[PDB]
Paper text:
Protonation of key histidine residues has been long implicated in the acid-mediated cellular action of the [name] translocation (T-) domain, responsible for the delivery of the catalytic domain into the cell. The function of the T-domain is to translocate the catalytic domain across the lipid bilayer in response to the acidification of the endosome. Remarkably, such a complex task is performed by this small 180-residue protein without the help of any additional translocation machinery. Formation of the membrane-competent W+-state occurs in solution upon acidification of the environment to pH below 6 and is accompanied by structural destabilization and partial unfolding of the T-domain.
Notably, two crystal forms were obtained from crystallization solutions at pH 5.5 and 4.5. Not surprisingly, the mutant structures also form domain-swapped dimers and are similar to the WT structures. Interestingly, the TH2 helices in the mutant structures are well ordered in a similar manner as observed for the WT pH 7.0 structure and could be modeled on the electron density maps. Interestingly, the Q223/Q257 sidechain conformations are distinctly different from the H223/H257 residues in the WT structures. Concerted movement of Q223, Q257, and E259 in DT-DM-B results in the formation of new hydrogen bond interactions, as shown in Figure 4. Moreover, the acid-induced destabilization of the T-domain’s short helix TH2, previously reported for the WT, is no longer observed with the DM.
Author numbering:
A (entry chain A): 2 to 39, 47 to 187, 200 to 349, 353 to 516, 521 to 537
B (entry chain B): 2 to 38, 48 to 187, 200 to 352, 354 to 516, 521 to 537
The structure:
Amino acid sequence: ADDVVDSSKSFVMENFSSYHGTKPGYVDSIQKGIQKPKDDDWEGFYSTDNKYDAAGYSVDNENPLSGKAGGVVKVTYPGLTKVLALKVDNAETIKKELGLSLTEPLMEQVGTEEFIKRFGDGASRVVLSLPFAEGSSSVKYINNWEQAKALSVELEINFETRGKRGQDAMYEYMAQACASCINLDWDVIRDKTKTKIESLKEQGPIKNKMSESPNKTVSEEKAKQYLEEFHQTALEQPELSELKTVTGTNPVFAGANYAAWAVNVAQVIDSETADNLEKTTAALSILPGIGSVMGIADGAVHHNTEEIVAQSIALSSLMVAQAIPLVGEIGFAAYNFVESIINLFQVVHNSYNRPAYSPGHKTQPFLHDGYAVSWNTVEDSIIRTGFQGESGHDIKITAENTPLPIAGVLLPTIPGKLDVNKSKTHISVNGRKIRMRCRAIDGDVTFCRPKSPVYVGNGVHANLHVAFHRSSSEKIHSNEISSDSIGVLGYQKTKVNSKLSLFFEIKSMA
Amino acid sequence: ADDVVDSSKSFVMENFSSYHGTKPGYVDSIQKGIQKPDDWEGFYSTDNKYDAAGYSVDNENPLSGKAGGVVKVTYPGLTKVLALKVDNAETIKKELGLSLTEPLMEQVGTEEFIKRFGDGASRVVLSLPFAEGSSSVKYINNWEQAKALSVELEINFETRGKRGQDAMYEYMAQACASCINLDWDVIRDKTKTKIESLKEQGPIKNKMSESPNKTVSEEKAKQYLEEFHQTALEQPELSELKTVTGTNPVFAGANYAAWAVNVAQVIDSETADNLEKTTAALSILPGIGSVMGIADGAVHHNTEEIVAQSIALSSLMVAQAIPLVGELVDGFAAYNFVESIINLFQVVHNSYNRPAYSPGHKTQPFLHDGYAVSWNTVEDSIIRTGFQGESGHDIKITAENTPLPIAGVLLPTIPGKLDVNKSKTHISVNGRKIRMRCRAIDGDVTFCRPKSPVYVGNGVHANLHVAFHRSSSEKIHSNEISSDSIGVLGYQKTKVNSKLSLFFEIKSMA
Ligand SMILES: Nc1ncnc2c1ncn2[C@@H]1O[C@H](CO)[C@@H](OP(=O)(O)OC[C@H]2O[C@@H](n3ccc(=O)[nH]c3=O)[C@H](O)[C@@H]2OP(=O)(O)O)[C@H]1O
Ligand SMILES: Nc1ncnc2c1ncn2[C@@H]1O[C@H](CO)[C@@H](OP(=O)(O)OC[C@H]2O[C@@H](n3ccc(=O)[nH]c3=O)[C@H](O)[C@@H]2OP(=O)(O)O)[C@H]1O
């Protein structure tokens, strides 16, 4: 029973409350009471501790990509409720270890007075708790359907009531989570986008460049060539002044990428598709290259003001309009295309609003120059402190195709307190153990280089094993250490090396 | 107790032997007996004589120096091999109760330890995994106890009388009896011959005199080196190479030229004169896969004749490149350059000979089209069989820079006894839970689409949780299942999707 219950995340509480995402049509009826609609082990009423994750369940089930969002309700049990947190979601296992019938549904047994007596610690009923999702700190709550009749149901937010376009109300709600926060007013962005489209189409050079279009089907090459010309003249108008400035250096935001995006849109959108928003979002949502239009690259949302986002969407919208004659299959460019891409913006912004480990942190890979490197486990990414002695840390390394070298690794040191254990530090290439020569560059950085050549690639990976020696029991101090990364050096290309960075955290023992 | 000892890999054995790599100069002296020139201070050996040979290279010229040999050492009588499940010395003595003050390996040589752990043997040898990615073990012997070791010769690489490190690598290649077992004597002789005869071909003399034969931009040098490559490829010395390098863009003339330019740009006169320094320099360059014929997880140039043609061609191109973008005796191109690149071939061939999980097997990432995907853990990549019920499987997903979509996932099914549990199968994007709509393609293939758009990229990752239900307890026979992979589909490019493959293993329970 211990092997399945996280007794440390379990607790009894009075007036236990949680949140339930509710779809259009039930935001009012569900407030009359939770009732079962007419694997069985997990049949029950689901809720979560996080009202923002609840809202993710609120979208029209017939149009989940683009349909209407209903609401979130807050449900509360009177009296005392036991939250029983489980370390597995395998019902056969749970019933075996909790001494239950292996034939009857798990969530049915959880509702019986015998289960409540044995596992309720005096509460009127038991609710099961499990991790909400990989990458989330929320929990999901599983309620037995009959016990859930005792819930009072109160409104938290009705997205319909807001009266806004698309899914704006839902995403604007979710962006509250982060008060590093994209919190855009999409009403402003819709109005400014409309305005800029209408007025760009009446700019001389644009009117000029428009008349110069083949206007009939051509080749992807002349299409792209003409649309890159159209992009420059458009970007020269003052409705796009700020965009021109922010898209000028980064090659992801180049006109050729706008043009490639426009061409790809024309090819996959037929007439049936354009006259259904759901169908249009399904089709746009699987194309590559949307980060050129979104202004997203290198781990950051660059286009993060209403004005710049509207300019970019305005620009894209016109380029789509001009590509459709060249490669199509016409008001779509300014109607559903704008509605659909707006929702895609909202999806991706929300992703970047959510707490998440960046590349090379914990077990998230660092992808660079054809290499992929990562900490082997989470514990490897932690340098413990406050003790005399040793630790070891494993980094996985490979590359995507041909053999790429590994020159060495840069390691942190603390003169007096933290040093490289030169005996146990080594690297292994498909099992071949390679010793390293480690030489201090100065008091804070040591460079270790393999004593024979290291190459990685498709079918060839390495495990870099870093060993640290602590000569005191003194806790390291943030002052004492500058870099927060281990630097693995790839190939050499003003000769510089490809730098692959693994980020660590200092922590005390536990 | 049992927390630090793996009994399943411990045993007593009579005449326990193991292997020790021995550096040049000590191959005869060490047969006189094991004598010593603190927790792990001890004599090291391994169960794999081929891994032993990887310790045999001159410690002061490790990249290009001579290889010494491998000896076999045997203990007369009974020896206890004690396999341990961790390698932190402080952790061993705690959980075993020894003295936290004397070195572990010292305590391992005492009668009280041998009495308590020897299970009747005259001494105890410690066993630990040899390295990540390796099946071999390393043995740690108490230095005093090791005086009892008999020491026989297994191989002396010097005695073989071969150039470079050929004797060491040809020994290592015996491990695989999908084996690269080249005769480098043949390759060296054919390379010298082809270099000489190519230099006397009329069109090559002709094209040579067309060189600017002076420092020029690298854009120019590359243009000329590309003309030279094509000319040289038309000569009968390279006819096979012309054929095997014609389609794959990795083996294109331009990459040979880029390579040749880079070589010329890093080799100075001192470097060119020293084989060790030339290998260090050459070993950190990108693009060596062009010359080696290594791409897509395979060594394509796998016959003596084609390797020598590729080495011969690159040699001539370096010779043409040096006057255009270097400053040394062209000289280098036919001598230390050839000697050095040969050693790099041997290193990489040896990596590809060693057993290794391919991309998308176990926890090795599958890298393709900007994405990176992997099984979260070894167990995730196993679909267990022989029982009724459920299992879960986590797949990690991200991309290198801009937001790239995940369109869906192809999953195996068996009409009878293996189904996709549609309510537990979901994808989580930086914690945001996204449910899936799963529809069958045929009786053996289910396709699941996310219900909100999924994008991944720098700073945005996803966890795909696949859940399988087994209705019968019958074990899954080989006929029943076609693919050995789960197919995650990326962006759409005759429309086709980017295919990211995660390979699984059907196994009975244990
Ligand atoms: N008076 C009412 N009483 C009870 N239910 C009502 C009522 N009115 C409407 N419902 C709906 O009935 C379903 C079950 O409670 C839910 O919608 P769903 O679209 O089928 O719910 C869709 C899925 O979302 C899950 N989910 C939904 C919201 C949430 O916050 N968390 C979560 O995990 C559900 O478990 C369900 O999973 P399964 O159907 O795969 O088991 C709920 O919104
Ligand atoms: N009569 C002799 N008796 C004992 N040793 C002798 C003798 N003559 C020469 N030696 C050499 O002395 C060293 C200690 O045994 C070894 O070489 P190394 O270059 O220092 O060996 C380099 C490292 O490789 C390790 N290693 C070597 C071979 C192997 O098969 N496995 C392995 O893990 C060694 O333990 C060593 O670790 P340390 O440098 O931390 O001691 C060994 O080859």
